[PDB]
Amino acid sequence: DPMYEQFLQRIQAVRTATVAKDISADILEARHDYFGRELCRALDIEYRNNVLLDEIILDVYPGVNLMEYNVPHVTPDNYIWTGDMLLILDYKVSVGHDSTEVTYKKYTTLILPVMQEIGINTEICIIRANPVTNQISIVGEQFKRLFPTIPVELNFARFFELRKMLLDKFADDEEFLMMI
Ligand SMILES: COC(=O)/C(O)=C/C(=O)C1(Cc2ccc(Cl)cc2)CCN(Cc2ccccc2)CC1
Numbered sequence: 001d002p003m004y005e006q007f008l009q010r011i012q013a014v015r016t017a018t019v020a021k022d023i024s025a026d027i028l029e030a031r032h033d034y035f036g037r038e039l040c041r042a043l044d045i046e047y048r049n050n051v052l053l054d055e056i057i058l059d060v061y062p063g064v065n066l067m068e069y070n071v072p073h074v075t076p077d078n079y080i081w082t083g084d085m086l087l088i089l090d091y092k093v094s095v096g097h098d099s100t101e102v103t104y105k106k107y108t109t110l111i112l113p114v115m116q117e118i119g120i121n122t123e124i125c126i127i128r129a130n131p132v133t134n135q136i137s138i139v140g141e142q143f144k145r146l147f148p149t150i151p152v153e154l155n156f157a158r159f160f161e162l163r164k165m166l167l168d169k170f171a172d173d174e175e176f177l178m179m180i
């Protein structure tokens, strides 16, 4: 596994709490990106990670004139354009709901106004995987209608092993326990 080994190499050679912080972060993001690929694979939809809203608009409505609109330059993880509806997908990997609400509020408030003016029928989807129990939670009714079952085989254990090593290595470093 080239990704585990590169994290491992970094956890082995890290000496300072600020570079440790970055490794923690990098882990949680690769754990997010891992779920995105597995999710998109199981549904057989295009995999993307951070698409600029302006780019999403132009794929779905080529004739648009961006300048005539105030488009917030958000980058949702992904989207599905069915031809009559746009599903804005963001991935999450969390035991709690707090990251989902924060993102749901952010995309509902910033993306939906401009999509209504442009006239594109849009829904905000947030798909979360609990990394401990592998259970998925979906916010988005049209998404649940298109994907009633999600047949993923998720295994987050290697990410947890790597971060636990990092947390143990810095268990007596007050500077790091604050940063996390
Ligand atoms: C899970 O959903 C998110 O939280 C998310 O997908 C965020 C991202 O894409 C960024 C990378 C990332 C970080 C941590 C984790 Cl664990 C997973 C992915 C990259 C884009 N970046 C937009 C941004 C940047 C600065 C301030 C405000 C927004 C956010 C982090």
Ligand SMILES: [Mn+2]
Residues within 6 Å of the ligand: 049, 050, 075, 076, 077
């Ligand atoms: Mn993202």
Ligand SMILES: [Mn+2]
Residues within 6 Å of the ligand: 032, 077, 090, 091, 092
């Ligand atoms: Mn995401």
